Tab-separated table of C-alpha atoms in Angstrom:
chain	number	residue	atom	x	y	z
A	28	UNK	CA	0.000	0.000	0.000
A	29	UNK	CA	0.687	3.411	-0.477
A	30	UNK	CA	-0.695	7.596	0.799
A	31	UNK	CA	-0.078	10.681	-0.216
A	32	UNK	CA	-1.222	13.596	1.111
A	33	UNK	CA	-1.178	17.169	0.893
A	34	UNK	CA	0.141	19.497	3.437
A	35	UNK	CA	-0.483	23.083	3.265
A	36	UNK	CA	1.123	26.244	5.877
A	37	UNK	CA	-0.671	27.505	8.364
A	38	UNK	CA	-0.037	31.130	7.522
A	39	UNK	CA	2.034	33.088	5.646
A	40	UNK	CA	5.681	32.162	7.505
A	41	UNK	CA	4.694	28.561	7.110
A	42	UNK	CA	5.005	28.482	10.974
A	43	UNK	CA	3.867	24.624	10.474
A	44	UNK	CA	2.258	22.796	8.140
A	45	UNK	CA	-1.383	21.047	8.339
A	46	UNK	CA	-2.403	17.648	6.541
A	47	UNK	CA	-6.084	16.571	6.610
A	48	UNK	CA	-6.845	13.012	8.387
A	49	UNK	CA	-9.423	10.618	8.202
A	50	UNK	CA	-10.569	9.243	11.587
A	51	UNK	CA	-13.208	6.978	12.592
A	52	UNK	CA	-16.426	5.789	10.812
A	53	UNK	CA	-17.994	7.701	9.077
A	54	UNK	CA	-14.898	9.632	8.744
A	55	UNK	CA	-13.969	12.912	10.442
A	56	UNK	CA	-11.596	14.978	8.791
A	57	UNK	CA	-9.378	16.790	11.184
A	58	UNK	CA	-5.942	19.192	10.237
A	59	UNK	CA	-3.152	17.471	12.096
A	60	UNK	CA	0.493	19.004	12.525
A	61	UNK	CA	2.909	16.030	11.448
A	62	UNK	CA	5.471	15.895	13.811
A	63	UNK	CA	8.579	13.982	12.909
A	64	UNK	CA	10.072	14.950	16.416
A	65	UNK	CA	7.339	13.778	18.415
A	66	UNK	CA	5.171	9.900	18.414
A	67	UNK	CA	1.614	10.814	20.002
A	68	UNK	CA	-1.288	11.390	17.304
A	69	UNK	CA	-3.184	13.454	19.673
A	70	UNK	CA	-6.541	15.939	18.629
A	71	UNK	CA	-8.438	18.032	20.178
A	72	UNK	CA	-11.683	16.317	20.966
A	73	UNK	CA	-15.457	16.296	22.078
A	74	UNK	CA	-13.904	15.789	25.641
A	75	UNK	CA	-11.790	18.628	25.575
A	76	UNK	CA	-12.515	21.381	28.212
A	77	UNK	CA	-14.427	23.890	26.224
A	78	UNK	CA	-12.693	26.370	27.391
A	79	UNK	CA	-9.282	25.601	25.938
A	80	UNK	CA	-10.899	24.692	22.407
A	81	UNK	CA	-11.479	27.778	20.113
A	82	UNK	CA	-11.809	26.806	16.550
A	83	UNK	CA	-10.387	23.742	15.763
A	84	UNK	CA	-12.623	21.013	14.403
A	85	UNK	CA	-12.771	18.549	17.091
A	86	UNK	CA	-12.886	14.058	17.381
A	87	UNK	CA	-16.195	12.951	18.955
A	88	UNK	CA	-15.341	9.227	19.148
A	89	UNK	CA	-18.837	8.487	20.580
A	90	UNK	CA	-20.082	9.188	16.577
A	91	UNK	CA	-17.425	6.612	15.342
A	92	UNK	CA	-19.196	3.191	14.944
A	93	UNK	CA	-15.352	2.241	14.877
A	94	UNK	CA	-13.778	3.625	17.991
A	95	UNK	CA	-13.020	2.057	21.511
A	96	UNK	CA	-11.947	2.962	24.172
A	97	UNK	CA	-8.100	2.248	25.482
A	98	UNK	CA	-9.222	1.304	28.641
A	99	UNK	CA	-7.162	2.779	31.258
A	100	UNK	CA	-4.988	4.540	28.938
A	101	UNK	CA	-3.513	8.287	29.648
A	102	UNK	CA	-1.301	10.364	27.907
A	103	UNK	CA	0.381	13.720	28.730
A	104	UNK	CA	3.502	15.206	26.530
A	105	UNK	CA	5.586	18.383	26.975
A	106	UNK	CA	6.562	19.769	23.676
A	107	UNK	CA	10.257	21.579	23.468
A	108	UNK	CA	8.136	24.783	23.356
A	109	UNK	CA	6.845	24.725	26.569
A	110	UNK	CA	3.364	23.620	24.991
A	111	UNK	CA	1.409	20.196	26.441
A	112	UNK	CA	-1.547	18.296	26.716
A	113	UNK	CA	-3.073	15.396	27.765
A	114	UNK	CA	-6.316	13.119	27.792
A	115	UNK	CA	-7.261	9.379	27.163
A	116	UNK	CA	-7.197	7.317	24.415
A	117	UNK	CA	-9.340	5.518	21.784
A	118	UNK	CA	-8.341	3.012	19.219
A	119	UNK	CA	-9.779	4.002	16.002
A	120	UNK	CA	-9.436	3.483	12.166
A	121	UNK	CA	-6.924	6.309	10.695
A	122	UNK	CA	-6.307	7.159	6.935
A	123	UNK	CA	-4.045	9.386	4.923
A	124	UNK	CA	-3.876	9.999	2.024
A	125	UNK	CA	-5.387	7.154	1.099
A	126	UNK	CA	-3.601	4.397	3.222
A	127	UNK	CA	-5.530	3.482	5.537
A	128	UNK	CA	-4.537	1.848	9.647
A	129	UNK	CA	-7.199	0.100	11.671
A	130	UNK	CA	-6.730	-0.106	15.596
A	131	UNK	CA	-4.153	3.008	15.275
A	132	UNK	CA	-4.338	4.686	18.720
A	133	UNK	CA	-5.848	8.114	18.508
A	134	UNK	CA	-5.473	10.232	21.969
A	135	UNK	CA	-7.863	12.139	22.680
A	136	UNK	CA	-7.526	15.536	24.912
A	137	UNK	CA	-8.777	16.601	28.308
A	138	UNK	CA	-6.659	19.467	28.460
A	139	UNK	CA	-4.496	21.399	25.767
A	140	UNK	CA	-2.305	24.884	26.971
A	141	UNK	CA	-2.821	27.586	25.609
A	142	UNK	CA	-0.441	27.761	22.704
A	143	UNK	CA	-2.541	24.856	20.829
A	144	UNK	CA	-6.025	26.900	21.892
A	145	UNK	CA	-5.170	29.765	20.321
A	146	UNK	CA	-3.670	27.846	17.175
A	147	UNK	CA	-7.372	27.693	15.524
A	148	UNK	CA	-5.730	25.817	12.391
A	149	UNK	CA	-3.745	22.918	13.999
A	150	UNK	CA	-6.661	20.161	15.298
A	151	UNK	CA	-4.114	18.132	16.847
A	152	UNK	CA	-0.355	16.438	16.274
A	153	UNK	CA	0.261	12.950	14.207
A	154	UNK	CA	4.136	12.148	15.237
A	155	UNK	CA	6.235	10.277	12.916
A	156	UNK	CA	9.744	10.009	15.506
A	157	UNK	CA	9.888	6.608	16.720
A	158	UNK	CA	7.593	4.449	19.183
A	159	UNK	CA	9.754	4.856	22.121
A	160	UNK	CA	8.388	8.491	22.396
A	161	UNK	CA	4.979	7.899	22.483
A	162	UNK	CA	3.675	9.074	25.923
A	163	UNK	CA	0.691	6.528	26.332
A	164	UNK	CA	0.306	4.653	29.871
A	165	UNK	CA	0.964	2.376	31.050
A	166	UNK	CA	0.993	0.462	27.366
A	167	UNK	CA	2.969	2.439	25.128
A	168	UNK	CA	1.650	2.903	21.451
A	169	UNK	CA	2.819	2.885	18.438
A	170	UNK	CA	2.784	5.784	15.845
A	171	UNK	CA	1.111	5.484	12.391
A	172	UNK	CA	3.698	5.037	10.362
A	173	UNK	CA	5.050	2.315	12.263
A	174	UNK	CA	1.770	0.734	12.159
A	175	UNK	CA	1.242	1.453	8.433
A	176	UNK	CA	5.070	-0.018	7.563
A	177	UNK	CA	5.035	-3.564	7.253
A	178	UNK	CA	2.145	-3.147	4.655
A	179	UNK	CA	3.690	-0.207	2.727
A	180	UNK	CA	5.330	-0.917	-0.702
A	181	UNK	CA	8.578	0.297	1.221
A	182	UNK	CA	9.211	0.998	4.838
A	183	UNK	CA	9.559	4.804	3.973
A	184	UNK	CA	7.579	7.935	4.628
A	185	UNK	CA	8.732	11.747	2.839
A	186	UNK	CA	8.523	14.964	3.468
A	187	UNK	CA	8.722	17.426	0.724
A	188	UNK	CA	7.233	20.775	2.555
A	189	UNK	CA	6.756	24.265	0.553
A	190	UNK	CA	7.992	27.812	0.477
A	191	UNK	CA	4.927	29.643	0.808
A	192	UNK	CA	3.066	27.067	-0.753
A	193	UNK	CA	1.799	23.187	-0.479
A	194	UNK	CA	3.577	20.158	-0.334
A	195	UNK	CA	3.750	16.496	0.434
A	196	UNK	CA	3.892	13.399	2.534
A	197	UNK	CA	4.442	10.267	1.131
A	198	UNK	CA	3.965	7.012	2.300
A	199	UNK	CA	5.368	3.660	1.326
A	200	UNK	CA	6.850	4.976	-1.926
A	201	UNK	CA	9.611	7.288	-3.077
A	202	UNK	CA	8.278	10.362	-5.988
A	203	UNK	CA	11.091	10.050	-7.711
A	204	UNK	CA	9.771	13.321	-9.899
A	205	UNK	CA	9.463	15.304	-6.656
A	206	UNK	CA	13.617	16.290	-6.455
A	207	UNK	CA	16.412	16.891	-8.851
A	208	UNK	CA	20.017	15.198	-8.732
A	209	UNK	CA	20.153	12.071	-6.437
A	210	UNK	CA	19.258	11.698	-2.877
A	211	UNK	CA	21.827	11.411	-0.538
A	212	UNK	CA	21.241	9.117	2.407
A	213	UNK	CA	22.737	9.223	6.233
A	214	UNK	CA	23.010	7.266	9.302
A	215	UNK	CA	20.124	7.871	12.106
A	216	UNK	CA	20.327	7.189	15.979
A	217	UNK	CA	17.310	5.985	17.294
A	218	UNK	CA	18.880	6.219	20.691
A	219	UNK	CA	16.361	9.291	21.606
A	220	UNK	CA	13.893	8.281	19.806
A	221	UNK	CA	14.224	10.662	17.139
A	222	UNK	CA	15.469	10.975	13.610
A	223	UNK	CA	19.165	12.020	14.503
A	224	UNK	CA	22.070	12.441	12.562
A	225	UNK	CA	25.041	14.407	11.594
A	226	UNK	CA	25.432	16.741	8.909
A	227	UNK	CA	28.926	16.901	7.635
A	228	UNK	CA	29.082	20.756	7.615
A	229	UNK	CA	27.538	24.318	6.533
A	230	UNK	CA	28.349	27.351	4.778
A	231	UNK	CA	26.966	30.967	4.473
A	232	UNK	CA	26.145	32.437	1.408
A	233	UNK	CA	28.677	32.115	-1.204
A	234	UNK	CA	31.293	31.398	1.643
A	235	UNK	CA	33.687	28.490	1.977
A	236	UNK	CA	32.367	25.515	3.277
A	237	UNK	CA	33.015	24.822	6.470
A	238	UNK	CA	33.494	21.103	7.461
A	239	UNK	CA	32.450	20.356	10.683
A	240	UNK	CA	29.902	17.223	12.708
A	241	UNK	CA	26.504	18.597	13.203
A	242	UNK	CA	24.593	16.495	15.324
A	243	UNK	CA	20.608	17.013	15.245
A	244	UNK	CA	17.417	16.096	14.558
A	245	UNK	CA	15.451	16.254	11.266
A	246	UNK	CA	11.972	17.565	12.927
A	247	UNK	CA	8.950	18.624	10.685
A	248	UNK	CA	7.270	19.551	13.533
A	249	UNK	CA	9.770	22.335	14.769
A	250	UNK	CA	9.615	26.000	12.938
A	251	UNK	CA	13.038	27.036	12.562
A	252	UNK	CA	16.539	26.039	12.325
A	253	UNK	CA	18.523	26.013	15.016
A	254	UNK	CA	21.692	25.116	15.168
A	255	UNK	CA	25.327	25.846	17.712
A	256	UNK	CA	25.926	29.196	18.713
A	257	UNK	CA	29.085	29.115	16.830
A	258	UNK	CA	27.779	28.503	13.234
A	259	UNK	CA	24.445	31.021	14.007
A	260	UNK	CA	27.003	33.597	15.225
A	261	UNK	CA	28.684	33.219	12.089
A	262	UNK	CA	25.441	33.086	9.610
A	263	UNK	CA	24.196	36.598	11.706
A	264	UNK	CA	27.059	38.065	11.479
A	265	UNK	CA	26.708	38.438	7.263
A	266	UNK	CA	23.676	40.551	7.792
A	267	UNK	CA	24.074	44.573	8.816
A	268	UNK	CA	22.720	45.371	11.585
A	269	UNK	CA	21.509	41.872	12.698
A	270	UNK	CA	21.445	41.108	16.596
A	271	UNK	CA	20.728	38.490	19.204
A	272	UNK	CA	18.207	40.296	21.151
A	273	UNK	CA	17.208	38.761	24.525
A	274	UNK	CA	14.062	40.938	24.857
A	275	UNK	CA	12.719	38.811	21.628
A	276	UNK	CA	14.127	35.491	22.530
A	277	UNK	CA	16.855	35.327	19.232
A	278	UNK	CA	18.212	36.777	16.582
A	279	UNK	CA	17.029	40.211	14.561
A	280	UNK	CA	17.556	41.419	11.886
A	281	UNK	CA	16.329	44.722	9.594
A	282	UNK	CA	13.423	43.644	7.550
A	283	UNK	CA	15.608	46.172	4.931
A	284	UNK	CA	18.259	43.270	4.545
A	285	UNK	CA	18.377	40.865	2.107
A	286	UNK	CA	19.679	37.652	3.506
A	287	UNK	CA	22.132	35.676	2.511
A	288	UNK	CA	21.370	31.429	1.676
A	289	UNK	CA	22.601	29.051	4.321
A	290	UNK	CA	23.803	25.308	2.946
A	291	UNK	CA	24.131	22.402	4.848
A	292	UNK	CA	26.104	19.000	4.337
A	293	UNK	CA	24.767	15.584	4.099
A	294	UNK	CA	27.204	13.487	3.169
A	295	UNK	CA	28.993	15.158	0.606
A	296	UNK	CA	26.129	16.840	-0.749
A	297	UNK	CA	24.706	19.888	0.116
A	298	UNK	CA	21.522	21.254	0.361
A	299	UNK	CA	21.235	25.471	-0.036
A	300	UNK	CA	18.437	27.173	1.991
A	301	UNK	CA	17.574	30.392	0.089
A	302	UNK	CA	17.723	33.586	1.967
A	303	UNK	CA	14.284	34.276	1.753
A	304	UNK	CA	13.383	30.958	3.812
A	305	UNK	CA	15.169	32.565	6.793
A	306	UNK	CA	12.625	35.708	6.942
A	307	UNK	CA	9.909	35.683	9.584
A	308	UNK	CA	8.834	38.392	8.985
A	309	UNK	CA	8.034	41.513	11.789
A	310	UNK	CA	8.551	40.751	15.536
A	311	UNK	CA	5.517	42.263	15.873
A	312	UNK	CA	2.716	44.627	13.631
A	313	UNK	CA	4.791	47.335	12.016
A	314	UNK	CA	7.909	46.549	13.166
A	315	UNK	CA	10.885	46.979	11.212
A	316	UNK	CA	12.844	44.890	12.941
A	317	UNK	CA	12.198	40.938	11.730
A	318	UNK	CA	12.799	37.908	13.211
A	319	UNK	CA	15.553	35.216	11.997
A	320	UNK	CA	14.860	31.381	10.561
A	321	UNK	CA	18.169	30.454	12.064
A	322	UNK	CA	18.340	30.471	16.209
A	323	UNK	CA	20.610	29.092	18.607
A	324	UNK	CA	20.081	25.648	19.818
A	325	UNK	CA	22.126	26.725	22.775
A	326	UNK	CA	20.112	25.196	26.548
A	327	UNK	CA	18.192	23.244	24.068
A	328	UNK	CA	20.575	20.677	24.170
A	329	UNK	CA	19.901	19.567	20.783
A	330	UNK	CA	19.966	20.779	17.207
A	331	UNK	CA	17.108	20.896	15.237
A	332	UNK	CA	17.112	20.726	11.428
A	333	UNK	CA	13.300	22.265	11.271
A	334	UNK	CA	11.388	23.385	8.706
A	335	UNK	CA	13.186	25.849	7.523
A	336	UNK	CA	16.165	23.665	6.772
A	337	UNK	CA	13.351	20.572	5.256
A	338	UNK	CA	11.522	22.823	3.100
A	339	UNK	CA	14.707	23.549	1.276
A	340	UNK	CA	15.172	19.713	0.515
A	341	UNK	CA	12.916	15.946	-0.200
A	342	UNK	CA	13.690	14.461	2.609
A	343	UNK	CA	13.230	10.336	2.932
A	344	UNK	CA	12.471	9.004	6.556
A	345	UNK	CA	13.763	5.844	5.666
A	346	UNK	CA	12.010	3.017	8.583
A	347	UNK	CA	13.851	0.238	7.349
A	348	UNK	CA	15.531	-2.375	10.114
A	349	UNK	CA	18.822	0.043	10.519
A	350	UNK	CA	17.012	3.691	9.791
A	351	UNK	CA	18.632	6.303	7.773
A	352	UNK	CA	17.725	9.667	6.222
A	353	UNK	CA	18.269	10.416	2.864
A	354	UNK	CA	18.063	14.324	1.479
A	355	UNK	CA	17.982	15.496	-2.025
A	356	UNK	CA	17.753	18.951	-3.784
A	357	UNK	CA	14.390	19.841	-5.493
């Protein structure tokens, strides 16, 4: 078997992306955030506190001829943003794109903070990292892809997200009309449960190329890119008048400035984010002072190749026995 589905930005940064979901009998279409750093598919639901729902199209599992209930199951995760929430937990029948996963558990919230409440356009999170992150007690779950794999053509998902515009998750089959060139693949570690590896280096604009271990994860469900202090220090420092601010929480720059591209190693390929992917536009209403694509990952403790840095490439999530990413240019 096979999906493919469309996923389209929020808003006009492409702070994340939404892909519609088919859950239950009769089916209820809900916009989930895939999340390649995370392995709970959680929504927002008719148990929800009403209060902390305010636009999002909610799961009522009691009008799913298909759902039951996880009895005694919980869940509660804590997102790298500070954001959480937490409920129980139905199994249900799940479809996207067209492949569909019967008994797939689908947690359902009790309580979301506020950064998902006033997010009307994200109806809940569909992780893709791997099953030792999923939250669910006390009988872990597994995610949908790794329910989906053994029937998929191949044990693969991709992620081929837009500037600006739509894009595309695969399952169980590589477009090979969706990049130019070749795609370059890479180990993973699966030690913390996420889609790690280690680019071989980066460069600024038409700059040298630096060569250099970068150890991080590729994350679809994280905005920006954010890398050691060292290399963002560097990337910053090509811009007039750019600035870590710590009134903002990162790096400024004039919205006058025309930024330069940032590339990034895999292997001994490279993959060039455009300037313009690294605009985010005001701080705030009017402002002419705009926020940066590239952050520090310093007291993050990881690196995070996010959306800015996937957009810029098709990117293969590669579930085979020994995982490994590939990237190519598109």
């Amino acid at each position: 078997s096979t999906g493919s589905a469309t996923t389209t930005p929020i808003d006009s940064l492409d702070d994340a992306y939404i892909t519609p979901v088919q859950i239950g009998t009769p089916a209820q279409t809900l916009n989930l955030d895939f999340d390649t750093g995370s392995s709970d598919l959680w929504v927002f639901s008719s148990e929800t506190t009403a209060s902390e729902v305010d636009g999002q199209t909610i799961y009522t599992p009691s009008k799913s001829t298909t759902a039951k209930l996880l009895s005694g199951a919980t869940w509660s995760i804590s997102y790298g943003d500070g954001s959480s929430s937490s409920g129980d937990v139905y199994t249900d029948t799940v479809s996207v794109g067209g492949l569909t996963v019967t008994g797939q558990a689908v947690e359902s919230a009790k309580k979301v903070s506020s950064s998902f409440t006033e997010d009307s356009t994200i109806d809940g999170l569909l992780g893709l990292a791997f099953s030792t992150l999923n939250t669910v007690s006390p009988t872990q779950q597994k995610t949908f892809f790794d329910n989906a794999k053994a029937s998929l053509d191949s044990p693969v998902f991709t992620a081929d997200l837009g500037y600006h515009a739509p894009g595309t998750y695969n399952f169980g089959f590589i477009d090979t009309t969706a990049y130019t060139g070749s795609i370059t693949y890479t180990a993973v570690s699966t030690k913390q449960g996420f889609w790690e590896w280690t680019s071989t280096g980066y460069a600024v604009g038409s700059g040298t190329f630096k060569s250099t271990s970068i150890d991080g994860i590729a994350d679809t469900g994280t905005t920006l890119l954010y890398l050691p202090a060292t290399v963002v220090s560097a990337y910053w420092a090509q811009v007039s008048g750019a600035k870590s601010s710590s009134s903002v929480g990162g790096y400024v720059f004039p919205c006058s400035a025309t930024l330069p591209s940032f590339t990034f190693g895999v292997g001994s390929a490279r993959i060039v984010i455009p300037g313009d992917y690294i605009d985010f536009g005001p701080i705030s209403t009017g402002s002419s002072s705009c926020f940066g694509g590239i952050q520090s990952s310093a007291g993050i403790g990881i690196n995070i190749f996010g959306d800015v840095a996937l957009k810029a490439a098709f990117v293969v999530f590669n579930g085979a026995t020994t995982p490994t990413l590939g990237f190519a240019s598109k």
